[PDB]
Design a protein around this ligand. Structure first.
Ligand SMILES: CCC(=O)SCCNC(=O)CCNC(=O)[C@H](O)C(C)(C)COP(=O)(O)OP(=O)(O)OC[C@H]1O[C@@H](n2cnc3c(N)ncnc32)[C@H](O)[C@@H]1OP(=O)(O)O
Ligand SMILES: Nc1ncnc2c1ncn2[C@@H]1O[C@H](COP(=O)(O)OP(=O)(O)OP(=O)(O)O)[C@@H](O)[C@H]1O
Ligand SMILES: [Mg+2]
Lengths: 598, 261, 247
């Protein structure tokens, strides 16, 4: 962050969301003036406010606002910006965009057009990687055009086969055939949806690796030929072939294999003559054998974790490389510092197909910025609207530590202290993934979610001790609300005689079971007897704050009260999962047995 | 010198004619009386005392500051008089000037009359012939209406308030009569509706005339807004004089007692 | 619940387009203590919202327009409901908070034949006689006599605030232009001039009809402070046995 280094003076961020905010923050730290484009609906977004100048580029849809290349060109001409940063997605990997930028004197911060077009298609990428002495997934090089050809390829490469759409991306046009009839009918169908959406109609037939691990290597290269492989990242936890939990240092990889993969990635980058930051993705099998799989010629979404473990600013490095300065770090200078874990908080319902996109307006939004070792990359704010036009991603939460256990503990704390009200999110799924025994041990594959939850996500299967803790907390909260209800100001005309009650006898209905609870209050401490078990709950009992911190038998728990009704229904978010309980008084519980069910 | 006296006489003569003789003839052709004739018929002869005769509107937008747009009195005649020897305060809206639309001066005069009436404890009779609020005035007009509204609620139960609709009252000119104790209409010449038939056609898409939407028959037979309807202005004013004899001047006074045979 | 809590989620809740409708219950929930609201008649006359809530621990009555239902227009049922709620709150020393977004009264022959005039006068009367502290916030629109009815400053209101999206006008811009420039018959630049000069809260602000144009995120705070100073409000009115409400 040296102000003496003379980089550009005006950079246009041709993107939206959290990536635009991150680029704007880096540019502001470096001292470069920032210009941000936006649509009509994003006129009040965070990134437009954080930028120095803003230019509307069209209506809500992306095809006419952020993919509207022409309007971006007039925005550049009007603002007279010197550099452009696409972030990831949209026009980040558009060769014709690169040609348009190269037509004028404004520079494109990223890889050259030749590198982008080389890795734009999967078959040519595989051919070049094979020519670049890099291990590749076994398969047939070429394009399959008929079902018989595909099934014959399945003959020589084995019954387990994968059919993939060329280029494309985004985890679509990619399925698995186990049999020859499966091979042919899947090939015909894949051609059908390739014509429907992609339009390329170019397909690849290859081998399916069983129980694979998605390991990425972050490469950084300048225009003078230097190239560093930095470190690796693990992104095994996926649904719909899309990552949701990323882990910076690989627990499955040792030093030797990591160094070999980094050297292979650097060799491939030098063969391509990459002159920016990119990622090379491999699929490591059980026997520690890695095969090349795609190379993203752009900034990676899950890049902040390698920044945390390496102490680097990738955006700054790409800006410096685009300016033309050489790399200021050597391969030996790269080192691993701690551990890092990232979770993608989405606006999806995890109970339906491991996340179904949802819409709404955020009524409450608070990030756990005060928690130790927590970094939040979000482009939203209270009052933000989750629309159908853009990616329904709420935030990226990164936690770093001295080791894996500390990082996971801080991740759990941050997930517990993160307030979203207005939409449905997948925080419960993230917490269940990070507290899973297999995840803690490290035995994770790309189908972790599929086999850990064969019937789909159901929530947290709370144990007996946790059930007692939850019941005690709910009963204490109910009694605290009842006690607060009796605090009036002095009237001096009709004094209030506070009802002196020692023990509250309650019936708490949770799931389909009913428990008898005896609660006693001694000021700030509640003694709760649930089915004989005795517990103590102490807290400040602030009933207005969205987060409530309590201490049950010494164990500290952070809970949220999402809803509360006079009829006794309360929704409580505890351990990341929302439980609906119904608390009645003992007399009310007895009299409720005469009520007819509707 | 003589200039001030001649200007005073000219302004008096102009105020007597309202907004011109041509519009007076147009009003007469419609079968309606002017505000001053209505006041003369309602009150005892030689007992009317007029106030705020020279008051003019203070609007300057949309070329309303021109001399041709200045009318002394500003579409309302306000004052006090006596019916059968008993005091009463009266205002009559002049449809001749800007269609009787309520400007700032209109509301100021009406509010002054209502304030004096509540100060002395005498009833208020209002002859309504207003086309609504003056659009050129803007929010001021709205404020004026609200002022009147407030005083109505302040005078409810203190002094009797009587409203006689003698013309096409529309828009916000329909809520002051609703806040008064009694409301009378004139057949075939008086109307009461918040929105006209054109807006109803634009939004609701139905064919109704002014008479069907807000006529005297509609408001006296099925709407329940008006209390009685009379044949014409003369009959209505005679019956209003007859009805005024029943009421006391204020809630501080007992029920009137007259000579019996 | 702190009384100075900011509500940044209200900064963009009102859409820019006048055709789009928002939910006033969201604003009410954001403003009040602990986002707790006891609504009265929630399933009847849904174009208006009345209920009880708390501000700084003090019971308050809330009346607001619902743009979701019938674009927030007033009719007979909503008028009666709001009028009776306001009358009760005034009779039992409960402060009133009003949120105003109303285009006017519902047109049609059904409303006119049902006595829309006398029922609409009920709400105006109820707001006019109220002697309890009353705080009004205009969110988007206040047109015609509906602006006067919905607790205007000229009804002895205490504090009136307008959001930067407020529009206080005698009527809509199109109707006003076509009723003023009928002789001029030139609506080319008339629309532009009228919307630039009158479609904003400035004409009401420069005449003192609204105390201030506040940022939405301060709304709750601005209300709470007011409720601190208006708790000792006392007014005197002429003596009467009772008044004659247009029942
Ligand atoms: C909050 C209060 C509100 O919302 S005010 C809404 C009022 N809406 C209007 O359109 C005003 C007039 N509306 C009408 O429906 C008719 O003109 C009514 C009232 C039925 C009168 O019927 P009619 O016998 O035909 O009289 P007219 O049309 O010839 O009018 C004569 C002149 O008076 C004028 N006038 C009338 N009202 C207003 C008004 N509110 N503001 C300004 N001017 C008004 C008219 O411009 C008309 O002018 P001109 O002399 O004929 O050229
Ligand atoms: N040979 C393979 N064996 C097993 N799983 C595979 C294989 N190839 C792809 N996958 C699955 O697909 C995921 C990655 O797919 P890939 O990166 O090719 O798709 P994409 O849509 O092009 O990706 P991106 O969003 O990065 O552009 C892996 O994590 C894994 O779940
Ligand atoms: Mg990939």
């Amino acid at each position: 962050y040296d102000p003496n280094e003379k980089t550009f003076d005006k950079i246009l961020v041709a993107n939206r969301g959290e990536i635009a905010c991150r680029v704007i923050r880096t540019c502001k730290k470096m001292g470069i003036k920032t210009v941000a484009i936006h649509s009509d609906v994003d006129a009040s977004s965070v990134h437009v406010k954080m930028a120095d100048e803003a230019v509307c580029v069209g209506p809500a849809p992306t095809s006419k606002s952020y993919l509207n290349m022409d309007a971006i060109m007039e925005a550049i001409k009007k603002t007279r910006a010197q550099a452009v940063h696409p972030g990831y997605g949209f026009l980040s990997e558009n060769k014709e965009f690169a040609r348009c930028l190269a037509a004028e004197d404004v520079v494109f911060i990223g890889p050259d057009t030749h590198a982008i077009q080389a890795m734009g298609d999967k078959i040519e990428s595989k051919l070049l990687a094979k020519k670049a002495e890099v291990n590749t997934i076994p398969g047939f090089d070429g394009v399959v055009k008929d079902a018989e050809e595909a099934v014959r390829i399945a003959r020589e490469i084995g019954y387990p086969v994968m059919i993939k759409a060329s280029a494309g991306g985004g985890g679509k046009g990619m399925r698995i055939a186990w049999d020859d009839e499966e091979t042919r009918d899947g090939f015909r169908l894949s051609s059908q949806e390739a014509a429907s959406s992609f339009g390329d109609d170019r397909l690849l037939i290859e081998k399916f690796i069983d129980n694979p691990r998605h390991i990425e290597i972050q490469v950084l290269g300048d225009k003078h030929g230097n190239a560093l492989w930095l470190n690796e990242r693990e992104c095994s936890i996926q649904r719909r072939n899309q990552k949701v939990v990323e882990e910076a240092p690989s627990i499955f990889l040792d030093a030797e294999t990591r160094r070999a993969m980094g050297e292979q990635a650097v060799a491939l980058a030098r063969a391509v003559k990459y002159s920016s930051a990119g990622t090379v993705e491999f699929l490591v099998d059980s026997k520690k054998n890695f095969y090349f799989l795609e190379m993203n010629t752009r900034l990676q979404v899950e890049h902040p974790v390698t920044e945390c473990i390496t102490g680097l600013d990738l955006v700054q490095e790409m800006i410096r490389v685009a300016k033309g300065y050489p790399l200021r770090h050597k391969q030996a200078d790269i080192r691993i510092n701690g551990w890092a874990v990232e979770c993608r908080v989405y606006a999806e319902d995890p109970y339906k197909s491991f996340g179904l996109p949802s819409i709404g307006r955020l009524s409450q939004y608070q990030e756990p910025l005060h928690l130790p070792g927590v970094r939040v990359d979000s482009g939203i704010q209270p009052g933000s609207d989750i629309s159908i036009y853009y990616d329904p991603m709420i935030s990226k939460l990164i936690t770093y530590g001295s080791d894996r256990t500390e990082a996971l503990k801080r991740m759990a704390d941050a997930l517990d202290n993160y307030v979203i009200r207005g939409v449905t999110h997948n925080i419960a799924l993230l917490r269940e993934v990070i507290i899973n025994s297999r995840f803690v041990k490290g035995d994770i594959s790309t189908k972790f979610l599929s086999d850990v939850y064969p019937d789909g996500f159901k929530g947290h299967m709370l144990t007996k001790s946790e059930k007692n803790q939850l019941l005690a907390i709910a009963s204490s909260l109910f009694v605290a609300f009842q006690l607060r209800a009796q605090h009036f100001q002095e009237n001096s005309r009709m004094p209030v005689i506070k009802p002196d009650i020692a023990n509250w006898e309650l019936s708490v209905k949770l799931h389909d079971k009913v428990h008898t609870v005896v609660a006693s209050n001694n000021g700030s401490v509640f003694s709760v007897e649930v089915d004989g078990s005795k517990l103590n709950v102490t807290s400040t009992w602030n009933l207005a704050s969205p987060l409530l911190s309590v201490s049950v038998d010494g164990t500290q728990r952070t809970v949220q009260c999402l809803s509360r009704e006079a009829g006794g229904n309360m929704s409580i978010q505890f351990l990341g999962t929302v439980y609906k309980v119904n608390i009645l008084t003992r007399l009310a519980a007895e009299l409720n047995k005469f009520m007819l069910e509707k | 010198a003589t200039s001030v006296n001649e200007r005073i006489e000219n302004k008096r003569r102009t105020a007597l004619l309202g907004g011109g003789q041509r519009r007076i003839d147009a009003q007469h052709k419609r079968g309606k009386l002017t505000a001053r004739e209505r006041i003369s018929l309602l009150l005892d002869p030689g007992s009317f005392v007029e106030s705020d005769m020279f008051v003019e509107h203070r609007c300057a937008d949309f070329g309303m500051a021109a001399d041709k747009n200045k009318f002394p009195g500003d579409s309302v005649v306000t004052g006090r008089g006596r019916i059968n020897g008993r005091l009463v305060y009266v205002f009559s809206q002049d449809f001749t000037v800007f269609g009787g639309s309520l400007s700032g001066a209109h509301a100021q005069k009406i509010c002054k009359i209502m304030d004096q009436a509540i100060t002395v404890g005498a009833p208020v009779i209002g002859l309504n012939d207003s086309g609504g609020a003056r659009i050129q005035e803007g929010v001021e007009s709205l404020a004026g209406y609200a002022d009147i509204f407030l005083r109505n609620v302040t005078a409810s139960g203190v002094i009797p308030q009587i409203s006689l609709i003698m013309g096409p009252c529309a828009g916000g000119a329909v809520y002051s009569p609703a806040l008064t104790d009694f409301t009378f209409m004139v057949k075939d010449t008086s109307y009461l509706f918040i929105t006209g038939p054109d807006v109803v056609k634009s939004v609701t898409n139905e064919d109704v005339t002014q008479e069907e939407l807000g006529g005297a028959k509609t408001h006296t037979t099925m709407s329940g807004v008006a209390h009685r309807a009379f044949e014409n202005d003369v009959d209505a004013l005679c019956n209003l004089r007859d009805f005024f004899n029943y009421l006391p001047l204020s809630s501080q006074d007992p029920a009137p007692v007259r000579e019996c045979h | 619940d702190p009384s100075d809590r900011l509500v940044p989620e209200l900064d963009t809740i009102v859409p820019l387009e006048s055709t789009k409708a928002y939910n006033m219950v969201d604003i009410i929930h954001s403003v009040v203590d602990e986002r707790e609201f006891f609504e009265i008649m929630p399933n009847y006359a849904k174009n208006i919202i009345v209920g009880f809530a708390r501000m700084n621990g003090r019971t308050v009555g809330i009346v607001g327009n619902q743009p979701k239902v019938a674009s927030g227009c007033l009719d007979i049922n909503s008028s009666v409901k709001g009028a009776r709620f306001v009358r009760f709150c005034d009779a039992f020393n409960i402060p009133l908070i009003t949120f105003v977004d109303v285009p006017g009264f519902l047109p049609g022959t059904a409303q006119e034949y049902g006595g829309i005039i006398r029922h609409g006068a009920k709400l105006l009367y109820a707001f006019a006689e109220a002697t309890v502290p009353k705080v009004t916030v205009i969110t988007r629109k206040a047109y015609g006599g509906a602006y006067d009815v919905m607790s205007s400053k000229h009804l002895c209101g205490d504090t009136n605030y307008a959001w930067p999206t407020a529009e206080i006008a005698v009527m809509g811009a199109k109707g006003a232009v076509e009723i003023i420039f009928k002789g001029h018959e030139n609506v080319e630049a008339a629309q532009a001039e009228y919307i630039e000069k009158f479609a904003n809260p400035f004409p009401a602000a420069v005449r003192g009809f609204v105390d201030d144009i506040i940022q939405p995120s301060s709304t709750r705070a601005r209300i709470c402070c007011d409720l601190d100073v208006l708790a000792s409000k006392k007014v005197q009115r002429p003596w009467r046995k009772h008044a004659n409400i247009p029942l």
